[PDB]
């Protein structure tokens, strides 16, 4: 299950709960076409990548988190290891998402 993050504190808790695992965060908006497009693929990822943690931030529900994370396009995928951001890209690109996960997992 992709865990929804609705506060700065929940984000910090999720990063701590991940330990050493790659954490991938989908920053999305329900009105944004490419976000809706990629959402089922993003949920399907736990079947492919069983030691990666998947989080979701809805930028409308959590504007202060969005601001802190310097998002400007959606969907934006941010990659975290041991509590730090180690990569990012934006766009509904299945191939790039898989390749980026593989590069950091």
């Amino acid at each position: 299950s992709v865990k929804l993050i609705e506060s700065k504190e929940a984000f910090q808790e999720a990063l701590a709960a991940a330990g050493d695992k790659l954490v991938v965060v989908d920053f999305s908006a329900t009105w944004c076409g490419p976000c809706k497009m990629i959402k089922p693929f993003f949920h399907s990822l736990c079947d492919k990548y069983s030691n990666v943690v998947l989080l979701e931030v809805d930028v409308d529900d959590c504007q202060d988190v969005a601001a802190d994370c310097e998002v400007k396009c959606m969907p934006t995928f941010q990659f975290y290891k041991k509590g730090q951001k180690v990569g990012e890209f934006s766009g509904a690109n299945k191939e790039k998402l898989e390749a980026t996960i593989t590069e950091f997992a």
Side-chain angles (χ1 to χ4, degrees):
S1 180
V2 174
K3 179 155 59 183
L4 185 67
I5 299 300
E6 296 194 279
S7 65
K8 295 193 199 188
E9 132 70 19
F11 202 154
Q12 288 186 354
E13 178 159 9
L15 289 181
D20 289 333
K21 295 152 73 188
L22 180 66
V23 175
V24 185
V25 188
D26 180 1
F27 294 80
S28 52
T30 60
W31 50 260
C32 179
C35 292
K36 291 183 278 195
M37 288 182 211
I38 199 67
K39 176 201 168 63
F41 182 83
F42 192 70
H43 285 57
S44 81
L45 291 175
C46 58
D47 312 325
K48 282 173 174 153
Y49 304 109
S50 285
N51 216 222
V52 170
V53 169
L54 306 174
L55 309 183
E56 191 198 311
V57 171
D58 179 323
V59 299
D60 293 308
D61 290 342
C62 289
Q63 295 192 21
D64 201 358
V65 170
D68 287 349
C69 291
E70 304 166 3
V71 170
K72 73 204 225 315
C73 289
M74 264 138 301
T76 285
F77 298 102
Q78 297 187 347
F79 297 78
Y80 292 80
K81 278 268 218 181
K82 298 152 60 210
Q84 295 203 239
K85 187 167 74 199
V86 295
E88 51 192 2
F89 71 88
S90 66
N93 183 339
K94 286 184 189 180
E95 171 88 8
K96 196 176 181 167
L97 181 50
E98 287 183 338
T100 307
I101 288 160
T102 297
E103 285 157 9
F104 289 104

